[PDB]
Amino acid sequence: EVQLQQSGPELVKPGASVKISCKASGYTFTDYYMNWVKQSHGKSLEWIGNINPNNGGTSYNQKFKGKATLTVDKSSTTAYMELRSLTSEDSAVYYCTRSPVRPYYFDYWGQGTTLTV
Amino acid sequence: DIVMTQSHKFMSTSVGDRVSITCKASQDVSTAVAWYQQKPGQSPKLLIYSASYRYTGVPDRFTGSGSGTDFTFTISSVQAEDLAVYYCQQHYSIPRTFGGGTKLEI
Amino acid sequence: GERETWGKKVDFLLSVIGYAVDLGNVWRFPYICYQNGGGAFLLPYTIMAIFGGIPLFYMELALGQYHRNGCISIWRKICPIFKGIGYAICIIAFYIASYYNTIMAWALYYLISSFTDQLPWTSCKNSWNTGNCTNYFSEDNITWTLHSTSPAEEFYTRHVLQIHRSKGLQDLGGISWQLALCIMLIFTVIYFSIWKGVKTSGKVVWVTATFPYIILSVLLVRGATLPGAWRGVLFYLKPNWQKLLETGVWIDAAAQIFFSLGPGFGVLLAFASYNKFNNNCYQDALVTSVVNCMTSFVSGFVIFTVLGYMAEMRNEDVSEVAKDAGPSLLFITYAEAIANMPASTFFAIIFFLMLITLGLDSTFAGLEGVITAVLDEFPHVWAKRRERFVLAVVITCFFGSLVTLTFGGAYVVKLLEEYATGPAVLTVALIEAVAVSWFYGITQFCRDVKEMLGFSPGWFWRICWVAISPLFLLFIICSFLMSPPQLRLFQYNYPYWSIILGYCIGTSSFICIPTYIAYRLIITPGTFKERIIKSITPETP
Ligand SMILES: CCCCCCCCCCCCO[C@@H]1O[C@H](CO)[C@@H](O[C@H]2O[C@H](CO)[C@@H](O)[C@H](O)[C@H]2O)[C@H](O)[C@H]1O
Ligand SMILES: Fc1ccc([C@@H]2CCNC[C@H]2COc2ccc3c(c2)OCO3)cc1
Ligand SMILES: *[C@@H]1O[C@H](CO)[C@@H](O)[C@H](O)[C@H]1NC(C)=O
Ligand SMILES: *[C@@H]1O[C@H](CO)[C@@H](O)[C@H](O)[C@H]1NC(C)=O
Ligand SMILES: [Cl-]
């Protein structure tokens, strides 16, 4: 009843920079977080960052210092994640997730952008 | 970080028995352990948060148990629509970390 | 001749202890210690205390005991070109008595509001609460929206402080009468307790400086029994040795020890002024610093056992609930923790009494320092009626703190806490240690201490007075002036005019030193060498 839409598959040149958009719709967008998770090919999940649409706050993973920047534009309720300096080692599916503040359960997940290097 | 492991990725009993996979935690997490159900190709849906409360809109068969260090996912008599992998996420501290997972064959 | 002595030698020790211990050892030390590696913070803390704190403390105490003068009259015996130190200290003490005397007013409001079997900040069906009043967890079924807030946080930001009536620092809105009455009562208490002097001060310090320890012990005993209390102690003591590689831990340790011991402020000079000549100030300063550090440690245990209880009742990671640094850690987090413990009324009463008694003696000492300084500076117009000039300074400090009692008071008190004290006090203490250890001569000081105590201080003290502590304070100053902090409070940033006003306030006291050495041009005219040789050398004893 409440699904998060994302982009589709694309080809990224190794070394360039790309973005992944997450258009949320169904509930009050300015009321919960917007978390990104990186699922490697046939491996475990991994939490990348955190976005607070109220004040543009951020809380990213320690192993993602200069790997992904997180921005938010609450005009059309979208979430941007720019992937800079991408090589053939982390190009995999990217999910957009929402989660309330500190029960921290991932409530809804995106469709799955199979980002291929 | 707070690493979270699971059992072997193959051992899973067939229909009729009790398929109960475990989740060993590195540090002491009181009850902040969630479970997910990612079918092949689809996106992971939330099943159980805080290891004892199931999310709204899930069947009554999916039950979670355990606290402190040993967390058990109790899904007994799996139907023909539960073949997936189940991850073990904790709500202790940032960054949050998931687990390896296990398939339920057959 | 005219100076007075302490009624008992224990009165001086208790007064210096009560000056050294304050809320900065209750809510400022545990947060800094946990953030900067946890248990591994005790090593840089101890190093910066041995090298930076204790030497300055002991030097200041010995100087104030020998010269027997305040922060203004002593500089006629060391370097009359640094006489503006007293006026700068007066300005800084005015700013501090303006801002710091509001935390105690908030504590007094909480105390007079806690007199009920059911505390106000444990419910949500009140007249000050909006729809975001989500009670404490007590369960994990109820979710938490990003706009949801705890009942105690809403009671603190909408009833005791009333921050929702002010749209920020741009407009304070209006002054409240409740906080005004509480701060008036506390200023009246301070005045009726500091009027006569050290002889009356040391008699109230017996209760004001010893009561916090009984309450701290009671809270420790209560916290060590709560379920899940071991998590807080573990997270507070589990070291993170990877943090010690960053300079931020050492900078924070230096700042914390300098603001916990508080040297170079004229309070220690004034307290040692009323002391005996042959008093062993060495043992006094040593035991005072040790008591201050042990009190910081005990209070860290007390706070973190209760935060561990909260992280067990609520979700874990005390680091998450202890997200903010300030009075909110005591008025929001610990308030919830008290309201959720059995027999909450008595614990809230004693906790707020502990806060009030921790602030009271600190304000006592901070005002007595300036009083003694200006009295020993102007004995012809004052010091004949000491009952006066104390009411005047209390009224001035009350009129200056009235601006903090407004609805937008948290912003103003944080602006005065983050700009008026740190760099100004650091520069004042640095230039004071330079004037005492270099211009006054470390040989004239070591022979002096040898004459008073009966033994010259060791070479370690000369090293810590000549090169270690000056470079220490210079390092703290260079670290603070290099990274201007963008402070925020309750999801509200500070504009650029706020930073400009804070820079003007922080320099509104240090600027009093150069203007004195400049305006002295009329007093002692002549060649430049004449002034350089007549302003460094002290007057004839
Ligand atoms: C030399 C003459 C100086 C004249 C006055 C100059 C004043 C300049 C404006 C104020 C300067 C910044 O003021 C000072 O900023 C530092 C960080 O920079 C703040 O410091 C804050 O962050 C640091 C980490 O960086 C912590 O270690 C510290 O405990 C915390 O308070 C101080 O709380 C504030 O007092
Ligand atoms: F810049 C700083 C100087 C001294 C400190 C002190 C260090 C020791 N522990 C208590 C701290 C508060 O001292 C006070 C309290 C009330 C006052 C005051 C000083 O002057 C008039 O009214 C902190 C900061
Ligand atoms: C809390 O959630 C559990 C999870 O299924 C449910 O069984 C229980 O009835 C809930 N209690 C409430 C809503 O009071
Ligand atoms: C919580 O506050 C926000 C803005 O501060 C407001 O929009 C929202 O309606 C509030 N929640 C409720 C339940 O009223
Ligand atoms: Cl301390």
mmCIF file of N, CA, C and O in Angstrom, chain A residues 98-105 107, chain B residues 49, chain C residues 134 137 140-145 148:
data_model
loop_
_atom_site.group_PDB
_atom_site.id
_atom_site.type_symbol
_atom_site.label_atom_id
_atom_site.label_comp_id
_atom_site.label_asym_id
_atom_site.label_seq_id
_atom_site.Cartn_x
_atom_site.Cartn_y
_atom_site.Cartn_z
ATOM 1 N N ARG A 98 13.016 3.057 4.641
ATOM 2 C CA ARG A 98 12.548 3.984 5.658
ATOM 3 C C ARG A 98 12.492 3.278 7.005
ATOM 4 O O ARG A 98 12.213 2.079 7.084
ATOM 5 N N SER A 99 12.765 4.030 8.065
ATOM 6 C CA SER A 99 12.800 3.453 9.401
ATOM 7 C C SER A 99 12.532 4.522 10.452
ATOM 8 O O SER A 99 13.098 5.620 10.382
ATOM 9 N N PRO A 100 11.681 4.242 11.435
ATOM 10 C CA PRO A 100 11.400 5.240 12.471
ATOM 11 C C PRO A 100 12.610 5.476 13.357
ATOM 12 O O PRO A 100 13.586 4.723 13.330
ATOM 13 N N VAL A 101 12.541 6.546 14.150
ATOM 14 C CA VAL A 101 13.674 6.907 14.993
ATOM 15 C C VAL A 101 13.716 6.019 16.230
ATOM 16 O O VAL A 101 12.901 6.145 17.153
ATOM 17 N N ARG A 102 14.680 5.107 16.241
ATOM 18 C CA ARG A 102 15.075 4.216 17.327
ATOM 19 C C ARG A 102 14.017 3.249 17.866
ATOM 20 O O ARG A 102 13.957 3.036 19.085
ATOM 21 N N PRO A 103 13.157 2.653 17.027
ATOM 22 C CA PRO A 103 12.977 1.198 17.099
ATOM 23 C C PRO A 103 13.874 0.577 16.044
ATOM 24 O O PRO A 103 14.259 -0.595 16.095
ATOM 25 N N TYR A 104 14.217 1.441 15.088
ATOM 26 C CA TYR A 104 15.066 1.164 13.931
ATOM 27 C C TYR A 104 14.777 -0.205 13.315
ATOM 28 O O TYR A 104 15.637 -1.085 13.257
ATOM 29 N N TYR A 105 13.546 -0.382 12.852
ATOM 30 C CA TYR A 105 13.184 -1.506 12.001
ATOM 31 C C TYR A 105 12.950 -0.985 10.591
ATOM 32 O O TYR A 105 12.243 0.010 10.403
ATOM 33 N N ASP A 107 11.139 -0.578 7.628
ATOM 34 C CA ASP A 107 9.719 -0.826 7.410
ATOM 35 C C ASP A 107 9.437 -1.218 5.963
ATOM 36 O O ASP A 107 8.918 -2.307 5.694
ATOM 37 N N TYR B 49 10.525 -7.592 14.584
ATOM 38 C CA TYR B 49 11.441 -6.637 15.188
ATOM 39 C C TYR B 49 11.449 -6.825 16.698
ATOM 40 O O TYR B 49 10.460 -7.267 17.289
ATOM 41 N N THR C 134 5.061 11.343 23.232
ATOM 42 C CA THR C 134 5.137 9.891 23.303
ATOM 43 C C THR C 134 5.860 9.508 24.588
ATOM 44 O O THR C 134 7.024 9.872 24.782
ATOM 45 N N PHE C 137 9.300 4.227 26.677
ATOM 46 C CA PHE C 137 8.985 3.007 25.944
ATOM 47 C C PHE C 137 8.121 2.052 26.758
ATOM 48 O O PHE C 137 6.947 1.846 26.432
ATOM 49 N N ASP C 140 7.834 -2.228 23.335
ATOM 50 C CA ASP C 140 8.377 -1.983 22.005
ATOM 51 C C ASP C 140 7.313 -2.022 20.917
ATOM 52 O O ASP C 140 7.656 -2.026 19.730
ATOM 53 N N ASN C 141 6.032 -2.046 21.288
ATOM 54 C CA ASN C 141 4.975 -2.068 20.283
ATOM 55 C C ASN C 141 4.803 -0.703 19.631
ATOM 56 O O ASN C 141 4.631 -0.608 18.410
ATOM 57 N N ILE C 142 4.844 0.362 20.425
ATOM 58 C CA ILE C 142 4.605 1.708 19.916
ATOM 59 C C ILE C 142 5.828 2.177 19.139
ATOM 60 O O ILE C 142 6.968 2.041 19.603
ATOM 61 N N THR C 143 5.595 2.719 17.947
ATOM 62 C CA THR C 143 6.670 3.240 17.118
ATOM 63 C C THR C 143 7.039 4.650 17.571
ATOM 64 O O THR C 143 6.432 5.220 18.482
ATOM 65 N N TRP C 144 8.049 5.227 16.924
ATOM 66 C CA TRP C 144 8.555 6.548 17.285
ATOM 67 C C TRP C 144 8.766 7.369 16.022
ATOM 68 O O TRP C 144 9.693 7.106 15.250
ATOM 69 N N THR C 145 7.901 8.356 15.814
ATOM 70 C CA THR C 145 8.040 9.268 14.691
ATOM 71 C C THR C 145 9.196 10.232 14.936
ATOM 72 O O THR C 145 9.552 10.531 16.078
ATOM 73 N N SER C 148 8.317 12.857 17.239
ATOM 74 C CA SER C 148 7.927 12.484 18.589
ATOM 75 C C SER C 148 9.006 12.878 19.589
ATOM 76 O O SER C 148 10.202 12.869 19.286
#
